[PDB]
Amino acid sequence: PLQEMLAAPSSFKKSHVLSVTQFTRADLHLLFQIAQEMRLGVQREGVLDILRGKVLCTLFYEPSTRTSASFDAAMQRLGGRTIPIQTSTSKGETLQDTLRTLACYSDAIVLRHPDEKCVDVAKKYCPVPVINGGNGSKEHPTQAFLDLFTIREELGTMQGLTITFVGDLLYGRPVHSLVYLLRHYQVKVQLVSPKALRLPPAVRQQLVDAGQLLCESEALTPEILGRTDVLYCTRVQKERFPSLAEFEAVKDSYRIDYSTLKYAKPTTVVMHPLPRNEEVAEEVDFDQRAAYFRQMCYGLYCRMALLALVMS
Amino acid sequence: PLQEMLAAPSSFKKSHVLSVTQFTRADLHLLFQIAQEMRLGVQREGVLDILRGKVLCTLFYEPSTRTSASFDAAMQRLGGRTIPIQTSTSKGETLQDTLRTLACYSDAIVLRHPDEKCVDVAKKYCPVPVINGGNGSKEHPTQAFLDLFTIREELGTMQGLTITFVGDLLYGRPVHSLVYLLRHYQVKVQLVSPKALRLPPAVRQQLVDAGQLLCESEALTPEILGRTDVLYCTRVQKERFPSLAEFEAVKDSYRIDYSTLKYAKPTTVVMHPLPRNEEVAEEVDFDQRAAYFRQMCYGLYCRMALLALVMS
Amino acid sequence: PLQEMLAAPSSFKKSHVLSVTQFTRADLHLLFQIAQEMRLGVQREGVLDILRGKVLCTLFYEPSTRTSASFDAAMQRLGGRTIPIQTSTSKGETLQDTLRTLACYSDAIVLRHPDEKCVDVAKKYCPVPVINGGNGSKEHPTQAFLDLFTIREELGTMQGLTITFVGDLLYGRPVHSLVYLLRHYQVKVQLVSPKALRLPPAVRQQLVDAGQLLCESEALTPEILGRTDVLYCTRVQKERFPSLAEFEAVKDSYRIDYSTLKYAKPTTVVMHPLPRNEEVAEEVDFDQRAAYFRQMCYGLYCRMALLALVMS
């Protein structure tokens, strides 16, 4: 059955994966279908036989253990091989020289780089598929895929859901990517954020265009929480505020702990792309609704399906 | 035959491997039996087919090439897959967040961490087996296993042996772990150490309880050496002494070179957990009795058998 | 057919690969033959089944992504396993201790080390084959092999060729190694270099002995370029010159860009061992004659064949 799905046509095949804007609702539906079978296969066989003759390089100019190890494990559980490039402390060879070098060894490269334009360098020069693992934190498409997959799997549907984004919605680009992916579905969105860290006007206008913008609030109210199906939290960082007083104030209001979960639904899904500071208290980690570690498991099967589609 | 042994019941199966205190004489006998077959299998096939669908993460917060590469090679020679997590220079994500992340990718994690309590964090939070590769140097259970295996294999038995521990017996915790493992057998122990760096009273009292304590000496005498079956050396570090004069004095007395081996038995086994400074001179490396590199080979088969038992 | 070639006798089998001076014209002919089949196999199967039960360690004391990842990918595309040792920032264990440790885990080690004498340490102490990935930049034998292979493959022959070495021919040791490998063939050599950075007298005298030295020039003339079949460029580094003025002067004269390629042949092969600074302009990267990335692909198949011969 996975064989049939992977034989089906896809925009992923032999393609760079650089932006969520490349892919359709149909593309993601197939990805999630294959992801579902990837999980069943792994439960049965552990290491599958899909990409046995393929080699993936991972090329992370800044470390992200959660992302790089996810791709390594996905590739190896597809039966493929991985070559993780040591992240140097360096000044060094140009990105395009390194990519063209590694393209002689591997069939695809996962690239994470602090320059947003790194995706344009990859497009111009790299003769094998490049998967964007983070381009100056502008986009992180497989994080967007796994976030959406997490919602679908935790709550079973997409229609009728209310999603509450809380924290730094200006710098929290995973929110923007997920807002783009949500344009097809009949959802409602609540934006809880300091006034300084609200969504960029273009992303807000995306929600307006879709008839999805429900409420905008500085405060994480019992009322907002009471109607939340998905509480998607972002990291609030001190550099976003000139004064410490304001920074700690906003943190204390937004901290997700038992004091705030008591206003949520029994079925609210608490999500966080991670790393976290203290915006989600450790005391809630064992709560049913704490889904930010299931998120990582969902990402494995999503990236297995992505790698299968790209390199098969 | 390995298949039969691995089908046999074991305390290792699906278990954390955190302390030598978890396991019995029977547990270790089975481990060593399987280790013996692991060596035969490797000699015949190089890479076996025991853990083909399993994935091991190695998570070393401080480097130990001898330990991490041993586990990587053992896992891969079992036919499994390995994901070695780059040791960062970092301040970073909490240990429990990282473990729960990597548990979504792998079936077991080998963890080395500078906090002794890291084993308690792993117990509370990690939903897959964690193997302790060193917890603030308090314990290193697979080092204890391979040390004991080395003795069994080099000398053929455990009964009637005299073991001489030399060096820093206060901070040299591999000695303490091995003393615990030796409680079942009819051995005699000689402790050669500066008075400041003698065994902790509890560990000494362990030897007394077992009727194994033979002699305690500041000097590495021709008499002590003449009755030594196993000379287990530890690193003496300058920080253990306020003055340089005392540090160099103790080093010169304890240095194992041809000048000191001439008093040993033709069959004395010279062991060292490594890394070494100068307490074992390079001139003895090619001597039959120099077993600290065979130790590493023995560790490979011991860790192959451990990984097989835990994850099969 | 690869099976027959690999069954054929070879100086590579079970041997250290430390210097180009170890191997004959016959040895290299077989290597290149096998390399050719390695490429066909990879095109068909991606990952072959030649070294399925073998384990390669890569041990790089200074990073060289192009070299270490090439060996990793070659080993894995032979169906073998790889254990890449993290390059530390460290003061640490002696080289011989580390090698003897890793020899207990792997069947061969690729070693790159800043001490030229590291090859002598490996010879004395390491009980498995060591492949020299760079010994204080004195030798880099597999780079020499792939350079020669690149010429053979790009131009089809070795007889009648004119090779032009340009840049730092004093510190550019890949030139010296390639000059040694070229002693069998009827080639002519042009040496374009500043007078301070000319070839060492012994290497020049090698070319004289072989009846291959054609011309020595400070300037990269239209005449020299017009007769060049292979333009092998080396990096010119500022430390080679006391004054910046001279350094930039020599760089501007030697920079390979369209302004200089217009004097070359339509068939001139532009080679560079890499990394490059600006001595080969990015504008020529898409030119047919720009072979420094095909070089890397050729290196993969060369190292596949080398690893097959050593460890089969």
Numbering used by the authors:
A (entry chain A), B (entry chain A), C (entry chain A): 1939 to 2028, 2032 to 2253
Sentences from the paper on this structure:
CAD is a 1.5 MDa hexameric protein with four enzymatic domains responsible for initiating de novo biosynthesis of pyrimidines nucleotides: glutaminase, carbamoyl phosphate synthetase, aspartate transcarbamoylase (ATC), and dihydroorotase. Moreover, in fungi, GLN, CPS, and ATC are fused into a CAD-like protein with an inactive DHO-like domain, and the DHO activity is encoded as an independent enzyme. The crystal structures of the ATC domains of human CAD and the CAD-like protein from the fungus Chaetomium thermophilum showed a dome-shaped homotrimer with three active sites between the subunits that are very similar to bacterial and plant ATCs. Here, we report the insertion by site-directed mutagenesis of two cysteine (Cys) residues in the ATC domain that favor the formation of disulfide bridges between subunits in the trimer.
So, for this study, we engineered a construct encoding only the ctATC domain (ctATC-WT; aa 1939–2253) fused to a removable N-terminal His6-maltose binding protein (MBP) tag and then introduced the mutations N2045C and R2238C (ctATC2Cys). Using these criteria, we selected residue N2045, in helix α3, and residue R2238, in helix α12. Structural determination by molecular replacement showed one protein subunit per asymmetric unit forming a trimer through the crystallographic threefold axis. The structure of ctATC2Cys is highly similar to that reported for ctATC-WT, as indicated by the low root-mean-square-deviation for the superposition of all Cα atoms in the subunit (rmsd = 0.439 Å) or in the protein trimer (rmsd = 0.704 Å). The high-resolution electron density map was unambiguous and allowed for the building of the entire polypeptide chain, except for residues 2026–2032 that appeared flexibly disordered in the ctATC2Cys apo structure. These missing residues correspond to a loop (the CP-loop) that projects from one subunit into the active site of the adjacent subunit and interacts with the substrate. The only important difference in the structures of ctATC2Cys that are free or bound to CP was the presence of the mutated Cys residues and the extra electron density between their side chains that demonstrates the formation of three disulfide bridges between subunits in the trimer. Thus, we conclude that the Cys and formation of the disulfide bridges do not alter the protein folding or oligomerization and do not interfere with the binding of CP. Instead, the double mutant ctATC2Cys had a Tm = 73.5 °C, 20 °C higher than ctATC-WT, and similar to the Tm of human ATC bound to PALA, which induces a tight and nearly irreversible complex. Extrapolation of the curves to an infinite concentration of the chemical indicated that Cys substitutions increase the Tm by 3–4 °C and that the remainder is due to disulfide bridge formation.
